[PDB]
Design a protein around this nucleic acid. Structure first.
Lengths: 458, 364
DNA sequence: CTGACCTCATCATTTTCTTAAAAACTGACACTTACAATGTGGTCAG
DNA sequence: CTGACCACATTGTAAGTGTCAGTTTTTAAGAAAATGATGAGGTCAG
């Protein structure tokens, strides 16, 4: 009964001792709970201690007040059942822990990003007179951000679109589900195979259907799509994961006319990697050719700028954007307003172009260095699509299958990426292994390649 | 929502001049350094392990939730935290909504095949027998505080709902915190999950009304059976909370620097509550007040002879934004047109004149 | 007619709160240098 | 012997370091205000 001098006050102790009398059944339902004045003298405490020992229990409902009469108990015998269900799980995860030598094609160089310009831009945004920027404003992104993106693409990638259409979102997947729900469940979607494992696995939930295709050195089987009944297609025009294949322009007229043939067809253009071609700038954007509103543009700030800021953009044609605005007036955006109002200045003053230039030159230098060390061993190793990209494809002509090769990389603490994962059909008798380097800086390429090549006995 | 000319009232708003910019800036300028090059690349999809262990400790020491860290899952916004649950459970369910409630599960079921079962809510809480007579499988309740009337579930109805859930294995329970930790005299009650030793209820909480609306973090906990299914079925997605915004909050709430903001905010709001109540107590003849004292908003009922439509337009005619209740409840409301007002976004030194001009707009 | 619910203060203690000083910072400049494009100048082939 | 082919040297910026002057973080101290517990009261029915 001694609960003074405790860091716990007397309120939540006496209010905790009434719990035992009501729940444990020492005090029955409807019994007269002693009024405060009899209790106040009883425990030697003043009224204002025991007053709040009770004035809480009215809200929790253990007791009820009568305006001129004492408090009365209204709390039945609780149905306490003791049974502990427990369920185990497989808990699939395909990524390894902290171990050296990561070659994953998504990584971008980390050390060389201008921390300091970032912090300086940040300091001017979140300040004392910049409230109104902790609550939510427009749900479709900062208006300045849309205008800035519209002016950036119109002079850097050939896009012709007004800001009112543009959309900002969180990553790509959450940028894709608002499209699946926007179109319907009566469609079938055209993909590439082998390719990127996103749109194939992401449709393991929805009713829609997907048609596997094949990829040549010219591109995708445009004629095959013509001799089929699919409606909206996923292609990667300016570059093709992971062979670096580039779509021929005549096939591009064919695909434009294919979409134009039937009114309800739309084309997804996903140019994730752009402005990263070593020579001769890069091919202009596909939608620059289209004139009658049949193509949607998808792109992101997440290999250019930073992997972990989780931002993207997406353009809509006028009839589809109007419908999206009518049917999605109640969602709210997933990109922090502060990040939006920071990047609007970050690209309003042109620093992103400087970052582009620096990383482009860094990555060229890395690629010529790797090729020049890679070239001397050619009896057993060959490359495809060297000129552009952040990754190479390395065919191994040793006389033994690729699983042991993959596991021997992790035997010597090296991360390797076989192409079997990206490939549905298994027609690879000479294994194709893709390697990335973008996370590993220049000074480490030599030792990394040397040890990984020795691992296979070279 | 909308921008305002002059003044507006909104329950989801907040008063932001009180937020410490600089105690955030210090953590930020600590967190992303040259030595910290690994944070640039993509992390885990459930939030960084520290950001989950710390949430586990915080919720155990503030709300009675006994959740082992690896269960909890992060998300961005609030609705985007929900969808992944919908497609996870299936499409053979019907969800229980309070007919007056937070109009969210209504608009997140208009786009999925399922449908919803409304319920009436009394001055003590939601019904508990209407669910029993019907075969609903999931119910969306607010155990700590009932938007927007303010009723609080007792022990009897809570125990009835939990025993109902334990009846069979085919039904699940949604807990929505809303504006808890702001309950003044006490901390409301040991949160509903505490009473459960059957692992049959999920937790859903937020970081966007107590810290910042626009930094967009939320979090749920899953019981032993559902967390494993969710992880094993959804390994291929990517987290949506920026990995740079996880370590800042891990510091911001690891050294004890969040409780010293919450404790300040309680007061920040209590004085405003008392001031507006003092101003209104003169006007008790007509403009009656309903609702237990907590949270961020009050519901004033106008027993004048004017209708809701002309009332609202007259309020907005003189640059005052009023918020009628017609939208929050499915059915047609009673003859006295109920009106919900929130005071959070108004400046403190202008309540006395803003409320006065509002009351002046309709009738003296 | 007791009995009931209820409005003010001052306490001991502590967890918020404004102040002044010294140390770390970061801006517009001084330049000075590397980097890599372009104009140029040497002979070559009927 | 000229147009072609092959050929280095000038050039206009990003990349490095020091100063300085200005806002700018870090730390100890004195002070204010809230909290829980005591105590003196307050009004009002049946």
């Amino acid at each position: 009964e001694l609960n003074r001098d405790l860091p716990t006050p007397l309120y939540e102790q006496l209010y905790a001792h009434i719990k035992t009398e009501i729940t444990e059944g020492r005090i029955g339902y409807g019994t007269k709970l002693p009024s405060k004045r009899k209790l106040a003298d009883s425990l030697k405490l003043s009224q204002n201690t025991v007053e709040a020992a009770y004035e809480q229990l009215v809200a929790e409902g253990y007791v009820e007040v009568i305006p001129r009469k004492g408090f009365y108990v209204q709390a039945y015998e609780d149905l306490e059942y003791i049974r502990a269900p427990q369920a185990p799980g497989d808990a699939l995860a395909t990524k390894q822990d902290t171990i050296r030598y990561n070659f994953h094609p998504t990584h971008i160089d980390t050390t060389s990003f201008p921390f300091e310009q970032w912090r300086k831009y940040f300091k001017q945004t979140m300040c004392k007179e910049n409230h109104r920027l902790l609550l939510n404003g427009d749900h479709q992104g900062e208006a300045s951000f849309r205008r800035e993106i519209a002016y950036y693409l119109h002079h850097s990638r050939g896009v012709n679109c007004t800001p009112e259409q543009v959309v900002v979102g969180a990553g790509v997947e959450t940028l894709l589900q608002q499209l699946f729900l926007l179109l319907g469940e009566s469609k079938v979607y055209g993909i590439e195979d082998p390719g990127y494992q996103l749109m194939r696995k992401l449709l393991s939930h929805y009713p829609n259907d997907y048609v596997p295709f094949q990829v040549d050195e010219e591109g995708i089987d445009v004629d095959s799509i013509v001799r089929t009944a699919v409606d909206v297609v996923y292609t990667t025009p300016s570059r093709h994961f992971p062979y670096g294949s580039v779509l021929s322009i005549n096939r591009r007229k064919q695909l434009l006319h294919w979409a134009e043939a039937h009114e309800n067809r739309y084309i997804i253009e996903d140019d994730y990697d752009s402005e990263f071609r070593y020579t001769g700038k890069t091919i202009p954007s596909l939608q620059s050719m289209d004139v009658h509103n049949k193509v949607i543009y998808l792109g992101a700030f997440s290999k250019s700028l930073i992997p972990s800021v989780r931002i993207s953009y997406m353009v809509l044609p006028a009839p589809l954007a109007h419908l999206y605005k009518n049917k999605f007036s109640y969602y709210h955006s997933t990109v922090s307003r502060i990040d939006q109002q920071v990047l609007t200045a970050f690209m309003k003053q042109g620093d992103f172009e400087k970052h582009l230039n620096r990383m482009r030159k860094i990555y060229r230098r890395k690629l010529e260095k790797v090729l020049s060390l890679l070239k001397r061993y050619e009896d057993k190793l060959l490359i495809i699509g060297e000129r552009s990209g952040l990754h190479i494809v390395l065919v191994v002509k040793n006389g033994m299958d690729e699983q042991t090769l993959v596991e021997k990389a992790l035997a010597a603490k090296a991360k390797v990426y076989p192409l079997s994962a990206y490939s549905l059909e298994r027609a690879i008798h000479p294994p194709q292994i893709v390697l990335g380097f973008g996370s590993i800086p220049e000074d480490e390429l030599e030792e990394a390649i040397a040890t990984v090549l020795n691992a296979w006995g070279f | 929502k909308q921008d305002t000319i002059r003044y507006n009232f909104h329950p989801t708003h907040i008063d932001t001049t009180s937020f410490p910019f600089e105690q955030w800036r210090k953590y930020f300028k600590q967190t992303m350094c040259k030595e910290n090059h690994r944070l640039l690349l993509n992390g885990d999809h459930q939030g960084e392990a520290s950001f989950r262990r710390e949430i586990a400790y915080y919720l155990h020491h503030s709300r009675g939730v006994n959740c082992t860290p690896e269960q909890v899952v992060v998300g961005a916004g609030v609705e985007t935290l929900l969808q992944q649950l919908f497609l996870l459970l299936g499409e053979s369910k019907v969800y229980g909504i309070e007919d007056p409630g937070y109009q969210l599960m209504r608009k997140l079921l208009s786009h999925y095949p399922n449908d919803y079962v409304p319920f009436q809510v009394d001055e003590e809480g939601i019904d508990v027998d209407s669910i029993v007579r019907t075969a609903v499988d999931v119910v969306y309740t607010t155990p700590s505080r009932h938007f927007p009337y303010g009723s609080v579930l007792s022990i009897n109805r809570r125990k009835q709902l939990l025993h109902w859930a334990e009846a069979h294995e085919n039904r699940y329970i949604i807990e929505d915190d809303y504006d808890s930790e702001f309950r003044y005299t006490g901390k409301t009650i040991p949160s509903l999950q505490s009473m459960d030793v059957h692992n049959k209820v999920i937790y859903l909480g937020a970081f966007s009304k107590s810290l910042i609306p626009s930094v967009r973090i939320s979090y749920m906990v899953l019981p032993a059976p559902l967390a494993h299914l969710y992880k094993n079925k959804f390994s291929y997605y990517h987290s949506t909370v920026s990995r740079i915004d996880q370590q800042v909050l891990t510091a911001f709430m690891k050294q004890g620097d969040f409780e010293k903001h919450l404790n300040r905010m309680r007061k920040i709001y209590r004085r405003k509550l008392e001031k507006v109540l003092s101003l209104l107590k003169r006007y008790e003849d007509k403009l009656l007040i309903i609702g237990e004292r907590s949270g961020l908003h009050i519901v004033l009922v106008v027993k004048n002879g004017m209708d809701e439509q002309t009332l609202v337009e007259k309020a907005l005619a003189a640059k005052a934004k009023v918020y009628p209740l017609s939208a929050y409840s499915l059915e047609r409301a009673i003859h006295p047109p109920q009106i919900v007002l929130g005071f959070g976004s108004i400046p403190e030194d202008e309540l006395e004149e803003a409320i006065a001009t509002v009351l002046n707009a309709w009738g003296f």
